[PDB]
Amino acid sequence: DNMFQIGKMRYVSVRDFKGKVLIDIREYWMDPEGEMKPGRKGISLNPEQWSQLKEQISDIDDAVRKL
Amino acid sequence: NMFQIGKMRYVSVRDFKGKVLIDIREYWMDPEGEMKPGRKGISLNPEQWSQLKEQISDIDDAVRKL
Amino acid sequence: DNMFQIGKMRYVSVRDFKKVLIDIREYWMDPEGEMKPGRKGISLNPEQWSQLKEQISDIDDAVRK
Amino acid sequence: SDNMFQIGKMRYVSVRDFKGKVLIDIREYWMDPEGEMKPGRKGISLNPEQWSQLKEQISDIDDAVRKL
DNA sequence: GCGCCTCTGG
DNA sequence: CGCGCTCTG
Ligand code: NA
């Protein structure tokens, strides 16, 4: 579908924005109304940015284990 | 410790108060010339970065199927 | 409800949000035809609203100047 | 050289003319890591028109609070 | 929440 | 954290 859950309250969602698709990695929350709303912590990537994130996982995992 | 993914977009692996942070963030340039982290960004713990990679295929399936 | 239009799609609201607040906000249209409030707003308690009212004269001078 | 009017602990009413458009902004401020006072997300900028209609509605707004 | 300053700060 | 598609202490 649209949503792919990565944290207890964080999802990476795919969405078509007028032909241009955005890969949005965002944290969510709920208002006093009980409905789920998005938050400030997040970012929407284009496909190229998403492609360049995947080919950087090499150094990402390496940098994580070096500290 | 930073890995670029966009024009002003970088993935920084850092240590903030004992725990490791994986920050996907967009930066901005000051008038003096240096870059500062901006509002658009999120920092994942190793556990959230864990399932992000596991869901990569599902995500790539969806970006094509749209 | 007790809505008070001030602009094109901007209203002021007197609400008892669980506290009495005078909220100035911009609103938008929903695909379901309804009208929803945006995040381009601010809620003022009666204290700040009174202070706001005591300085309109000073602000009206500034806009004229 | 003085165009701001305090209404709260960190809330102010500022006025200016950004490229001919005159705005009367009511919002809350914050402090950045550079030690400077910056406007915040809680607020709204009004044109003189919306500023006039706000004043012409203060009557009913004041007694709507009293009814609550 | 998702061109350009009299702007942009995890 | 001002000038097409989301509330408030
Ligand atoms: Na920020």
GROMACS .gro file of N, CA and C in nm, chain C residues 16-41:
model
   78
  149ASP      N    1  -1.328   2.648   2.433
  149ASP     CA    2  -1.287   2.597   2.564
  149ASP      C    3  -1.216   2.464   2.538
  150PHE      N    4  -1.091   2.474   2.496
  150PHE     CA    5  -1.012   2.357   2.458
  150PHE      C    6  -0.974   2.280   2.584
  151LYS      N    7  -1.069   2.200   2.632
  151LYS     CA    8  -1.047   2.108   2.743
  151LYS      C    9  -0.995   2.180   2.868
  152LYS      N   10  -0.968   2.517   2.911
  152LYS     CA   11  -0.906   2.647   2.895
  152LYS      C   12  -0.974   2.727   2.784
  153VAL      N   13  -1.006   2.852   2.812
  153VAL     CA   14  -1.065   2.940   2.712
  153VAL      C   15  -0.954   3.002   2.628
  154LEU      N   16  -0.967   2.992   2.497
  154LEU     CA   17  -0.865   3.042   2.407
  154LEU      C   18  -0.930   3.112   2.289
  155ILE      N   19  -0.874   3.227   2.253
  155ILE     CA   20  -0.915   3.300   2.134
  155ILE      C   21  -0.814   3.267   2.025
  156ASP      N   22  -0.857   3.189   1.927
  156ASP     CA   23  -0.768   3.129   1.828
  156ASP      C   24  -0.789   3.193   1.691
  157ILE      N   25  -0.683   3.252   1.637
  157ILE     CA   26  -0.681   3.308   1.501
  157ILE      C   27  -0.609   3.209   1.410
  158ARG      N   28  -0.676   3.167   1.304
  158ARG     CA   29  -0.628   3.053   1.226
  158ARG      C   30  -0.671   3.067   1.081
  159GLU      N   31  -0.590   3.014   0.992
  159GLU     CA   32  -0.626   3.001   0.852
  159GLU      C   33  -0.683   2.862   0.830
  160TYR      N   34  -0.782   2.852   0.741
  160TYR     CA   35  -0.851   2.727   0.718
  160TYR      C   36  -0.840   2.688   0.571
  161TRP      N   37  -0.867   2.561   0.543
  161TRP     CA   38  -0.852   2.507   0.409
  161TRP      C   39  -0.970   2.417   0.378
  162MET      N   40  -0.986   2.385   0.250
  162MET     CA   41  -1.092   2.296   0.205
  162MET      C   42  -1.038   2.154   0.192
  163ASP      N   43  -1.122   2.057   0.229
  163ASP     CA   44  -1.102   1.913   0.229
  163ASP      C   45  -1.168   1.849   0.107
  164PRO      N   46  -1.111   1.739   0.055
  164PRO     CA   47  -1.176   1.668  -0.057
  164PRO      C   48  -1.320   1.626  -0.028
  165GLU      N   49  -1.358   1.612   0.098
  165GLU     CA   50  -1.496   1.581   0.135
  165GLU      C   51  -1.585   1.704   0.139
  166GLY      N   52  -1.540   1.816   0.082
  166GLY     CA   53  -1.616   1.939   0.082
  166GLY      C   54  -1.611   2.017   0.212
  167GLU      N   55  -1.573   1.954   0.322
  167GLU     CA   56  -1.573   2.021   0.451
  167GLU      C   57  -1.460   2.124   0.458
  168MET      N   58  -1.464   2.205   0.564
  168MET     CA   59  -1.362   2.305   0.591
  168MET      C   60  -1.283   2.262   0.714
  169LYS      N   61  -1.151   2.260   0.702
  169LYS     CA   62  -1.068   2.214   0.812
  169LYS      C   63  -0.969   2.322   0.854
  170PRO      N   64  -0.930   2.325   0.982
  170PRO     CA   65  -0.832   2.424   1.028
  170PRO      C   66  -0.690   2.383   0.994
  171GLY      N   67  -0.610   2.482   0.954
  171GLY     CA   68  -0.470   2.461   0.925
  171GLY      C   69  -0.383   2.484   1.046
  172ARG      N   70  -0.253   2.464   1.027
  172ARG     CA   71  -0.157   2.487   1.134
  172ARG      C   72  -0.100   2.628   1.132
  173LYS      N   73  -0.139   2.710   1.035
  173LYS     CA   74  -0.101   2.851   1.031
  173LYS      C   75  -0.197   2.928   1.121
  174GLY      N   76  -0.176   2.914   1.252
  174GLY     CA   77  -0.258   2.985   1.347
  174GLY      C   78  -0.186   3.007   1.479
   0.00000   0.00000   0.00000
